């Protein structure tokens, strides 16, 4: 297609040289994804204060990234020494990396606030005295394998990443601010159903795909496990390569499971806009899904190299940051409160033409982990909302008495010397349970160790890596105070099977948080097998148990369960332990929460689309909203296109 990126770049350069003083020495101006990069020979005059950069960003309506000229670059050892001397010793810098190709130094520090500065003046001071553009990322207190691998992949593929970013920036700004003639919303999946979500945003200029996911419940049937690839609009977009970007709401298999499949068969080549916690958690979940599919004997959906390609094609966006991802579409992300890095996708199509907010999975009540979902937007016309708990009789129990019952059950179990086994998801409810247990044990209620097995430790490390995405209480504790709730010594990690055997054989009371809520794999099955005959122990279920799983069999009240032994003979598990079920820790919004979010959203949307739930639940939610507030509501099926404007 025809592009006018060169004319836009020339106009931007003319505006810059009109505004920026001549002593700066501007050499090259280019686009790197959704941000503008300016190369100068005198960084001292360019950024003596933040007012000039702020004025340039306000005038150009772009994210300005000032970088020094590659010709004026200090030696890496002298640059490292100068950076270490300039940064205060309170901020413990761990790793410093340099990019010879483009002026940029990556600084890994335990306290990025001191490296950045009170108002960013420390970054300007560093890039002035050292002539190296600084990029600061947080070193987690708990080491994370996924984050280290992602950072190593990004650093080792700098040339490919820069080429991809330049191509994305050229494609995004192919033309200036364009008013779309029409806006179309089509659902390739997740409409009147749970899982395999897929939302396509179509205009006359650009196309946007939102939370491309997969279905695990119907994995046996290919017609229901994956989004509708037979849609004529999706086929036209993929065949012609017109997909501008893909945005993932949050890191779950029903929202990001099908992402590596596109890169496996080279069906996509553009960028992916997720928050860094969402990217890390979705990479971990995709790797676990691939490993599980491999272990089950079925053909894996994709390969780890496809996940690496997804990592290489991912652009990280923070909360509240407005970026241009299309000639007519502006994308910003807001907190959702469901899981770590969960974002509500807000799309600003045109210059005030229309606004779409896709909430996805979200929570509107305050929690121990994350702040409630953002209900305030600069402009809102169409709202897309989940309907997982959209039924009239769907009313989840409040959090405080559920956690009180959990605490009292755990205390009763530990009073008699038993062991508490809590099967849980890899992300979500497990971290909330750990936070509740840490709060209870901080007053001296319990002294027994808490053991995390499987992906719980990795998810905890990822949570520690991004404390700004957590709730206000945890943020205040970590930043204002010196206390980190996740760094409690009670939380212990078991390395191998020998440590698990020692934990099981030990007579001292302990709390074990496994990584399989249904007891279908992982260390949860072994823990249940080795702790079931003991009557002093107890098992607490914090999630719904699907039919046909071992966890549902234990929850229903089966005293004995026949299983296949190691030698090939049937084995009988005597479940003499206590069984408890507390389903009050669900991260999904309640029906009352959904109604409150509809009532308290500002501004009031013109129409509301109910998706991500069962068909009768979605219809009930839409009818209730229409009857209570008078807003027009629709619950379309799959392959349904709605013309918003």
């Amino acid at each position: 297609r025809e592009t006018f990126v060169d004319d836009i770049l020339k106009e931007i350069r003319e505006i810059i040289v009109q505004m920026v003083p001549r002593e700066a020495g501007i050499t090259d101006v280019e686009f790197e994804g959704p941000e503008l990069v300016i190369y100068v020979k005198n960084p001292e005059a360019m950024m003596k204060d933040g007012e000039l950069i702020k004025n340039l960003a306000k005038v150009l309506k772009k994210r300005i990234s000032v970088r020094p000229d590659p010709d004026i670059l200090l030696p890496p050892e002298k640059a490292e020494e100068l950076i270490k001397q300039l940064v205060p010793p309170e901020a413990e810098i761990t790793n410093i990396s340099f990019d010879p190709s483009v002026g940029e130094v990556l600084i890994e520090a335990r306290k990025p606030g001191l490296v950045i500065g009170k108002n960013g003046e420390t970054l300007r001071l560093i890039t002035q005295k050292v002539h190296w553009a600084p990029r600061v990322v947080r070193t987690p207190p708990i080491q994370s394998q996924t984050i280290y691998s992602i950072r190593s992949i990004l650093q080792t593929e700098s040339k490919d990443r820069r080429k991809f970013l330049r191509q994305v920036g050229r494609n995004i700004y192919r033309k200036s601010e364009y008013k779309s003639r029409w806006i179309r919303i089509t659902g390739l999946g997740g409409f009147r159903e749970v899982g395999r979500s897929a939302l396509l945003v179509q205009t006359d200029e650009s196309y946007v795909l939102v939370d491309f996911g997969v279905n695990i419940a119907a994995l046996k049937d290919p017609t229901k496990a994956y989004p509708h690839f037979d849609a004529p609009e999706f086929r036209y977009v993929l065949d012609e390569g017109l997909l501008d970007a893909i945005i993932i709401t949050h890191a779950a298999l029903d929202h990001s499971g099908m992402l590596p499949y596109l890169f496996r068969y080279k069906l996509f080549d553009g960028p992916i806009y997720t928050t860094p916690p969402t990217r890390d958690l979705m990479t971990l979940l995709q790797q676990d899904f691939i490993e599980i599919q491999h272990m089950n004997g079925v053909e894996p959906l994709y390969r780890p190299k496809d996940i690496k390609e997804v990592i290489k094609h991912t652009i990280t966006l923070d909360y509240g940051e407005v970026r241009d991802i299309a000639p007519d579409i502006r994308l910003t992300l807001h907190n959702a409160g469901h899981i770590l890095g969960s974002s509500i996708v807000h799309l600003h199509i045109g210059n005030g033409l229309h606004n779409i907010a896709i909430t996805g999975d979200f929570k509107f009540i305050p929690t121990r982990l994350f702040e409630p979902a953002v209900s305030r937007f600069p402009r809102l016309e169409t709202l897309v909302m989940e309907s997982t708990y959209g039924g009239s009789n769907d009313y989840q129990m409040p959090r405080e008495e559920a956690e009180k019952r959990l605490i009292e059950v755990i205390h009763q179990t530990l009073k008699r010397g038993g062991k508490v086994l809590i099967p849980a998801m890899a992300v979500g409810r497990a971290q909330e349970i750990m936070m509740v247990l840490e709060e209870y044990a901080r007053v001296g209620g319990i002294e027994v160790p808490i053991y995390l097995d499987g992906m719980i430790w990795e998810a905890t490390a990822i949570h520690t890596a991004y404390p700004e995405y957590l709730s206000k209480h945890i943020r205040e504790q970590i930043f204002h105070e010196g206390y980190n709730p996740f760094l409690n010594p009670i939380f212990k990690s078991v390395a191998n099977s020998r440590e698990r055997q020692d934990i099981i054989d030990s007579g001292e009371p302990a709390i074990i948080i496994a990584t399989s809520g249904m007891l279908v794999g992982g260390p949860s099955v072994e823990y249940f097998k080795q702790l079931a005959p003991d009557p002093k122990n107890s098992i607490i279920f914090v999630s719904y148990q699907a039919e046909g799983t071992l966890g549902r069999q234990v929850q229903r009240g089966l005293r004995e369960i026949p299983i296949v032994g190691e030698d090939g003979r049937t084995e009988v598990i005597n479940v003499n332990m206590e069984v408890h079920t507390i389903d009050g820790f669900s991260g999904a919004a309640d029906r009352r929460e959904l109604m409150s979010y509809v009532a308290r959203v500002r501004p009031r949307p013109e129409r509301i689309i109910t998706v991500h739930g069962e068909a009768h639940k979605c219809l009930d939610l839409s009818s209730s909203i229409h009857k209570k507030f008078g807003i027009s509501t629709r619950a379309p099926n799959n392959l349904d296109a709605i013309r918003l404007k």
Binding site: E547, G548, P562, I563, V564, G568, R569, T570
Partner: protein
């Protein structure tokens, strides 16, 4: 189908059982070997009854144990195609009902229980009919005919059994008596 077979086999008896009775040691070894697995030719191996005859030991190089030719009786249960069985429902599932007919549990599909559009009731784990208004619950005398046998693996639990109840004469004992009342 319960079966009784007389099997002649070579039994390896370790030196730790040298002081015991040869017949008792052979029976213990045979119980450790054959009991608890599925045989492709004979079906589920239930138990080893007794050892009839035992021969003198033979010592082979590389092993100190003695090998004896033993004759023993085996009780086995084998499911065959198109075989009518009588059992009791022990497990209820949304996709079907599991009936205990012996060492293995068969599966009857939701369309297969009766000539009616039966739906599952989750609250009580029962099947409720639409026109016949018949209810199936725990501990019910039922009769079905096997239509599917899987011998893919030697593990009893991994093997699957599928039975039918569409045909006349297959169902609950009360239902059978109701059918016989008309005739």
């Amino acid at each position: 189908m319960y079966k009784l077979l007389k099997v002649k086999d070579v039994v390896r008896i370790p030196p730790r059982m040298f002081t015991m009775d040869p017949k008792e040691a052979a029976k213990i070894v045979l119980r450790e070997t054959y009991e608890g697995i599925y045989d492709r030719d004979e079906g589920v191996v239930l138990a080893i009854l007794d050892v009839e005859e035992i021969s003198e030991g033979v010592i082979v190089p590389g092993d100190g144990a003695t090998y004896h030719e033993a004759i023993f009786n085996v009780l086995v249960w084998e499911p065959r195609n198109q075989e009518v069985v009588e059992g009791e429902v022990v497990e209820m599932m949304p996709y079907g009902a599991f009936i205990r007919i012996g060492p293995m549990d068969g599966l009857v599909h939701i369309s297969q229980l009766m000539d009616d559009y039966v739906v599952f009731d989750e609250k009580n784990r029962q099947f409720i009919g639409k026109e016949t208004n018949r209810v199936l619950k725990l501990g019910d005398y039922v009769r079905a005919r096997i239509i599917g046998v899987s011998v893919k693996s030697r593990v009893i639990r991994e093997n699957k059994i599928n039975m039918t109840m569409r045909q006349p004469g297959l169902g609950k004992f009360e239902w059978i008596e109701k059918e016989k009342k008309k005739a």
